[PDB]
């Protein structure tokens, strides 16, 4: 997996370019997915220039005459099965090319070698051919290229007309050619011997290899494409395609002409994200622009509000952002116009890109800095690419533009600064608006009647609205969601409860919104859409709002500015309409909107202020969905905006779904009225009304940012109208008709149920004399509210049955649980066998079943030490595995006690914070686990209050006592699936006996992710649900995120069976398991092991108080105080009795069915039937999508291999074979090898042996030292312990020193290299991620996110990049150079020193949590002196030597950065 | 204030008269809370989910809600909430055996932290409302033309 | 792919419900894939059945005409989205068709439904 | 204690046997018989009378302040059969080590090498 490009700077063709391209392709085999077959690949491609002499000699040989101009060569994939479709394709191509007048020289068959392809990639192999078209009309080059592009589009459309499959055009141009296929990377020149010729010479070359998540390859999906090559994945494609569908209807350009009619549906069907992006890129380039301009217009830079960029670039970025919607997502691009060659990065800068200039005027760029072998005395400058940066080469002029020079050259074409001044803001409009027209607030009776009509209780104002107006942040809950799903409910649940949010698993990383907030914008523009193929001042004349949510005064100002161009639309249907009134109202409004848009109206205000005793209010989401979809289908959405006035909007999830459906601006007036009414009673205290409204709006905007960042989208303009949700319980027809692109895997209620519910609530509100609001139960149990899974009698009965040890009481509990009306998906399924019952005693033993239950991980931060230890000792007694969760563990618990109790935990977790991950924390377990997303809060990081952090937890996590610890949402190690494979390889290297588990969350599209993670040698999958508990998390994430595990498990099982992969990995489920029936159902669906969790906590005393986050749980389960911890009443025998009863129930059920083991029932889905609730509820749920049975074939339906899935062996083995005297004799050693970029995790296995032998701190520093010469691989020296010293001469790729544990790393350029040490990148991204101890001396510049989550390490580096020193917690870091934006963000412990010569730190620093000053104490000067002296001694640098020579005058150039929280805890005060 | 103060406060019932004095008269033995003491004893609640104080009360009042509306002043709204689900609140608070119905199953009572004094706060919030005229009869708006008969004038009858 | 199936299902359900008939649900036909060869198994489609009931009380011939029109419309709509490997072996209130790419004698083995009484 | 082991993996059996004991031959991996040295072939090593400190005198079991001249012959190797006998002895006393013979380049060394 990777992209790469090679370019001759001066622009002269030569064979060395293609030779080096092939050599680079031959060395990316370590990142791809290995297969046991040895021949099966998943894609490869190269893209070069056309060898004119080759084809001209071929034409001469055939018998024609060599033409004067350049040739045109097309490469096509035709069908292979039938010999008649080939003839049709050929005649179509020839009748479409000859329509312009060009002369066709003939066809040629490309020589291939089919002995190297596998079997699955060979059954669908297409027929590869080439067509040689010459130019005889004598037209210029650019006109010829335009004609060829038009001809290609016409041929595609014509062949789509006849419905012919397996047809593709890999390229058709007079400049370039593409050789791609479904072979391995190294076998590219073997399948295509043409490239082995001596005449194939080019001045540029691009190459790409991909990594697929499934095992069904198709040839037309192999990159590079035509004028694009992409690495990564784009988050926003469902929203960008919907905007292209509206942009098309107005675009036109005189270059194309009438033929423009044949390019209207620019984005066809059957493409990926990197295919649609490439299509729009090409259609924008072919119309006049240049590759840098298109790259800036499609994937722009982060428009920052900082004085570190000239105003010209700011104006350019403003113009680009206004004209087009960004295409976000992790993306490394290597594109090529006909003239330029560009390599660029996305907004956040996630994927790596590194380049190199040689003295031959040759630039080589790629994902790894050691692909092409280059003698070390030929380099002129090494470098990298930050976020939004780019590097370009002009071939026609032979010049090289770096980032700043290219920006300064691009800011010259048009007067952008004079153009940007046309835009008008809104704050000016609301300030010039006179202090008049303030309307009178509604009556208390009217307000209560309008609130009761929508179901707003008093608990939605005392619990989730008071914190917003009081503080500015949302509420916080402390337990899972045990309330019924929307359709199975019986109260009036609003329509916004049927839409679950989305998030990103391993395929994409989420975005942190607390620290990286500078790259997230909430800009809204009215009057923006237009011709996207123009460059004039009329393009930037619009109205700009700084937030999509509006207050009433701002709404009135905007309405008065709009004036006579807006058209108001009613959204109410008559209560006396009849059985089909809602459908008629929808029809009516969606016709009036279209009729008003055609009449000149350019603004649509969809209001519902006409709701009264005889008119019910249409659900706002349905109305805006219908209107937006109709406007999109009728080619009119490009003309207007869409403004909604809602009366139900009170929570952040409402605004999210309204903007996701397509609304432009959202106005909520009833919430403002309620706030004003609650204020005039004097409840908020002494704060004015404007401050309250500002706090409310700020809270809503922060919640919107949080919801937006769960998916990876940093802009609102590309998130609007995309449908980033999932409907559960809405009928297939309704969703497919009124909503753009959402999946409803089970059909639900149509329109009649919605109408019935709305009418019932409206009648209840408007015909009954209302005097107060119902107390309501949605977040806390109430007798009048809805039903809950955990009531009082259930808890008491379970605790009694567990304490007194009476199985009859446990059966009573189980019956009480299984007698309630249906509340979850698994309540409509019913077991039905066909055999005869067997005696109970014949089924397997209780032990063999109890060894299938595990308890999930619950951190020591949330729980108390007593409860954690109690669970651990109780689960190790029956023989089953326990779990420790994040937050580390106590080492004193590593040995059995004197009484025999074993307080250890057999499953260690690797969270996103790496809070206790050391080298010994991993060698004390039997199964590792990677936590990608939790059940309760998916796509987010766990939290911990400031008062929960006592001294013990502070020492256990290596942090500061008394500071809020919030985990980062993303992983900083897992940005794609190849990084996940790398991390799993690392984990399997550090612990040679354990298994690796990947934990996901149920949602739609999990099947492909599971098929992808199963190829990364993972061997246990864990599928959590939406109902899992948590320690502390927001309420909207608890209630409105996730999906039941019945969907995820039954999808993963089928997708894994389809790919012939189920026989390798195990499945494990958890979340909402209470009885034995649930366990048997989960086993039938496909799972093998089970997690219990919350029920266990109830067995130890927890009574569902739901105050875990407040640190005042009365029983003392989740408490860190002492006087409350003294109230603990837990006991391991309780948990043992719980598990015994739970296993005996499963034995009883399996005996009653007719089987004698759980292995006989796993996967047998046909033993389940779906029953209806009755003929009075009328829900059309069909669970058949999860009852479909995929026949396995030869293999069984479960894991049938012992031991973990093995991995290849790196250099470490040789070292272990050479330093045997260290392990037997106990002596020093010294080794020297040659490192290559194809060797990962050098020095990790040795660390494992040393840890097992002596321990982490058993050896003196430098006991065993290794010297490497060359480009090291990735994760060099991960998890190295004290006593190991690595010394690399050259460079390292990425993750260098990840998870250091006392070792020592030294990276320096080779002695014979003529390079300035302080102006060349030497190491890559994510250095020292989560280190705990050790040292690292580098003699160059680091990458991005340098030293994130550092805890005890000490690093001296000669430079840095963006986001450096982020969220650091302990250690010292000296940077002798420049830094990037957002420096020292979220830092909460340690110290830093920056050597600023230009005095530009106060512009880059993130000065909120840290203070920076000048060194004024000698004790801190001697520290810096000793650190730099050690640097000079180790790496023998020259810059640091000069700094040490002139010490007295350079000491006054250092800035000292110290966190704010450590200002009163240090020994020596930084002041005097 | 944020009402979770069962950690740093101790439960104490209202004023009581000694035994040597109780034996003579026929009046009550307890007294009504003071304002600053009621606003303190109603603050020991925890607003626990799944409130056992309500599951075991035969009339099932919304106990946490008026315990909250009492701990923040706002006594009239608390009276409304208490009265809207019980016809004789003060009589119940005076005679209802609380050690077996509500005070005997409070979550902080099961953990040996003592029990939130519920019935005494019922008395306080329902008698201080009587003195200021917040109590009014429920006269029907439109007199319906029907007549119903009952036998007995006990609690059920009334 | 498990996503094209959902698109086909939603198309069928949005085209059948346009006339007003009541959809009872889907059913998966039981099969036995141990008898098919290898070349006829690599392209095997997913066989399913849909049970549509008549609630409007129209006559039989009008019902057959509606079903034929619905079948034609579904075919055209699914051809519009360019979805391959989709077929309707029958849609009627009178007859049914059990066909495949197995041997002649193994027909009742691949389709055990016909072994019913 | 720095792990720096001061031992030597090769022990010599000189012509004088100045320190050859039973422990001196069981504390090696690979032995070596020295027949003739490169600088002085057919001669024994010398050591001046003032070079012999007390430490060397104790290490060689000799008299302090006395010139030590090794005997040119071996008194154990008078022909190839005695060499085979000595090699058998050395391979019996140490069951893990190898036996190395050290010669000096001259004409006729080929037959001697084929014999050893
Ligand atoms: C108090 C608490 C803390 C938790 N902490 C973690 C955690 O740190 N990491 C994690 O992956 N899951 C954590 N979980 C979730 C559990 O691992 C598991 O997913 C959940 O308890 C299953 O829900 P259930 O008990 O209803 O089956 C926590 C759950 C609770 C209740
Ligand atoms: S008395 Fe206890 S159980 Fe009742 S509401 Fe208060 S905290 Fe909850
Ligand atoms: S004292 Fe009041 S709240 Fe308690 S049980 Fe009696 S009536 Fe219910
Ligand atoms: S709800 Fe939470 S606060 Fe304690 S009693 Fe249960 S773990």
PDB file of N, CA and C and ligand atoms in Angstrom, chain B residues 45-48 51-53 64 67 106-108 116 118, ligand 2:
ATOM      1  N   UNK B  45     -30.898  14.044  49.500  1.00  0.00           N
ATOM      2  CA  UNK B  45     -31.292  13.168  48.410  1.00  0.00           C
ATOM      3  C   UNK B  45     -30.167  13.062  47.389  1.00  0.00           C
ATOM      4  N   UNK B  46     -30.239  12.025  46.560  1.00  0.00           N
ATOM      5  CA  UNK B  46     -29.215  11.788  45.559  1.00  0.00           C
ATOM      6  C   UNK B  46     -29.730  11.809  44.130  1.00  0.00           C
ATOM      7  N   UNK B  47     -31.027  12.020  43.916  1.00  0.00           N
ATOM      8  CA  UNK B  47     -31.629  12.015  42.585  1.00  0.00           C
ATOM      9  C   UNK B  47     -31.233  10.761  41.811  1.00  0.00           C
ATOM     10  N   UNK B  48     -31.331   9.633  42.498  1.00  0.00           N
ATOM     11  CA  UNK B  48     -30.896   8.362  41.951  1.00  0.00           C
ATOM     12  C   UNK B  48     -31.866   7.870  40.886  1.00  0.00           C
ATOM     13  N   UNK B  51     -35.684   5.170  41.348  1.00  0.00           N
ATOM     14  CA  UNK B  51     -35.845   5.573  42.750  1.00  0.00           C
ATOM     15  C   UNK B  51     -36.709   4.576  43.507  1.00  0.00           C
ATOM     16  N   UNK B  52     -36.106   3.892  44.475  1.00  0.00           N
ATOM     17  CA  UNK B  52     -36.856   2.971  45.313  1.00  0.00           C
ATOM     18  C   UNK B  52     -37.799   3.684  46.270  1.00  0.00           C
ATOM     19  N   UNK B  53     -37.576   4.973  46.532  1.00  0.00           N
ATOM     20  CA  UNK B  53     -38.482   5.721  47.395  1.00  0.00           C
ATOM     21  C   UNK B  53     -39.877   5.802  46.800  1.00  0.00           C
ATOM     22  N   UNK B  64     -38.564  12.400  44.310  1.00  0.00           N
ATOM     23  CA  UNK B  64     -37.364  13.188  43.990  1.00  0.00           C
ATOM     24  C   UNK B  64     -37.675  14.576  43.473  1.00  0.00           C
ATOM     25  N   UNK B  67     -38.596  16.821  46.361  1.00  0.00           N
ATOM     26  CA  UNK B  67     -37.389  16.948  47.170  1.00  0.00           C
ATOM     27  C   UNK B  67     -36.391  17.899  46.525  1.00  0.00           C
ATOM     28  N   UNK B 106     -34.974   3.618  50.916  1.00  0.00           N
ATOM     29  CA  UNK B 106     -34.167   4.615  50.227  1.00  0.00           C
ATOM     30  C   UNK B 106     -32.787   4.047  49.917  1.00  0.00           C
ATOM     31  N   UNK B 107     -32.232   4.443  48.768  1.00  0.00           N
ATOM     32  CA  UNK B 107     -30.957   3.875  48.330  1.00  0.00           C
ATOM     33  C   UNK B 107     -29.861   4.174  49.342  1.00  0.00           C
ATOM     34  N   UNK B 108     -29.836   5.398  49.876  1.00  0.00           N
ATOM     35  CA  UNK B 108     -28.862   5.742  50.909  1.00  0.00           C
ATOM     36  C   UNK B 108     -29.231   5.162  52.260  1.00  0.00           C
ATOM     37  N   UNK B 116     -33.279   9.509  53.867  1.00  0.00           N
ATOM     38  CA  UNK B 116     -33.809  10.851  53.679  1.00  0.00           C
ATOM     39  C   UNK B 116     -35.166  10.939  54.360  1.00  0.00           C
ATOM     40  N   UNK B 118     -38.438  11.635  54.469  1.00  0.00           N
ATOM     41  CA  UNK B 118     -39.387  11.991  53.420  1.00  0.00           C
ATOM     42  C   UNK B 118     -40.686  12.515  54.015  1.00  0.00           C
TER      43      UNK B 118
HETATM   44  S1  LIG E   2     -34.453   9.082  49.229  1.00  0.00           S
HETATM   45 FE1  LIG E   2     -32.836   7.848  48.210  1.00  0.00          FE
HETATM   46  S2  LIG E   2     -33.977   6.570  46.711  1.00  0.00           S
HETATM   47 FE2  LIG E   2     -35.397   8.232  47.341  1.00  0.00          FE
HETATM   48  S3  LIG E   2     -35.075   9.856  45.779  1.00  0.00           S
HETATM   49 FE3  LIG E   2     -33.676  10.349  47.505  1.00  0.00          FE
HETATM   50  S4  LIG E   2     -31.712   9.353  46.927  1.00  0.00           S
HETATM   51 FE4  LIG E   2     -33.309   8.436  45.588  1.00  0.00          FE
END
